[PDB]
């Protein structure tokens, strides 16, 4: 991707995280576990449904359209009718295919951007009381219990208290 997070420095997905698109996996003395991030997933869902609804709305319903008849001395008008029908069909086929092809790439870049933003948000919080390992992973220097974990996954991690 353009942002280098999905299939980048984080090289795989989690099949054990079932309730969201992006999230955390933690590990301390109490135990382990996954947990989704709700704000990022909610924003992404809003954006994606908006995009799908706009795509649906820009194409209007097609009403009754049946062919005509001509005799042996009206070949020019028959050819003009065929020309018009074929041209409009070709134009709309091109439009639909191009729209889908171009929207798919932007949709795939959106999720990469969201994952990168989440990683940076956590990294600026921990700054000094944690070591960056490389796979999207942080190893604490002090002892981080469940209150510490839940404060990290909230944005209100208190840097001075843990030096």
């Amino acid at each position: 991707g353009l942002f280098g997070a999905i299939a980048g420095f984080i090289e795989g997905g989690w099949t054990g995280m079932i309730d969201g698109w992006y999230g955390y996996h933690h590990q301390n003395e109490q135990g382990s576990g996954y947990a989704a991030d709700q704000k990022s997933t909610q924003n992404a869902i809003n954006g994606i449904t908006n995009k799908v609804n706009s795509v649906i709305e820009k194409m209007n319903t097609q009403f009754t359209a049946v062919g005509k008849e001509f005799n042996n001395l009206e070949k020019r008008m028959e050819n003009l009718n065929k020309k018009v029908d074929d041209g409009f069909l070709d134009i709309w086929t091109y439009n639909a295919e191009l729209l889908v092809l171009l929207e798919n790439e932007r949709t795939l870049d959106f999720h990469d951007s969201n994952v990168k933003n989440l990683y940076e948000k956590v990294k600026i919080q921990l700054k000094n009381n944690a070591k960056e390992i490389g796979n999207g992973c942080f190893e604490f220097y002090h002892k981080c219990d469940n209150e510490c974990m839940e404060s990290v996954r909230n944005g209100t991690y208190d840097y001075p208290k843990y030096s």
Epitope: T41, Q42, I45, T49, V52, N53, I56, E57
Partner: nanobody, 119 residues
């Protein structure tokens, strides 16, 4: 948004029933949808709900083997099917919004109601 259920139905025991729910706005939604039951003279009862994109469905432990909830997405409709009707599945059925994409305890928009009688 506005939620509109289907019409009122009367059946006899041993059969099944299928109610529907239609929401205004764009066909695709970013909130979960739940179904609530209320018998005459008692408090409401949560039956089950559905999630917008992941497609997960949740049911109450009482209504485990009978209820089936489905969606249409492109139409904007949600369907609920209840099987093996007893004489106790005679109540008012409501369709409820949820706010977010998860089936939490906060339903902020309700429909109007639909009576299903069994006899």
């Amino acid at each position: 948004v506005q939620l509109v259920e289907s019409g009122a139905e009367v059946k006899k025991p041993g059969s099944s029933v299928k109610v529907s729910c239609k929401a205004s706005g764009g066909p695709f939604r970013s909130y979960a949808i739940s179904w609530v039951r209320q018998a005459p003279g008692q408090g409401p009862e949560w039956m089950g709900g559905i999630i917008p994109i992941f497609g997960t469905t949740k049911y109450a432990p009482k209504f485990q083997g009978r209820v089936t909830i489905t969606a249409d997405d492109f139409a904007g409709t949600v369907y609920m099917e209840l099987s093996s009707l007893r004489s106790e599945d005679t109540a008012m059925y409501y369709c409820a919004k949820h706010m977010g994409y998860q089936v939490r305890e906060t339903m902020d928009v309700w429909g109007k109601g639909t009576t299903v009688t069994v006899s």
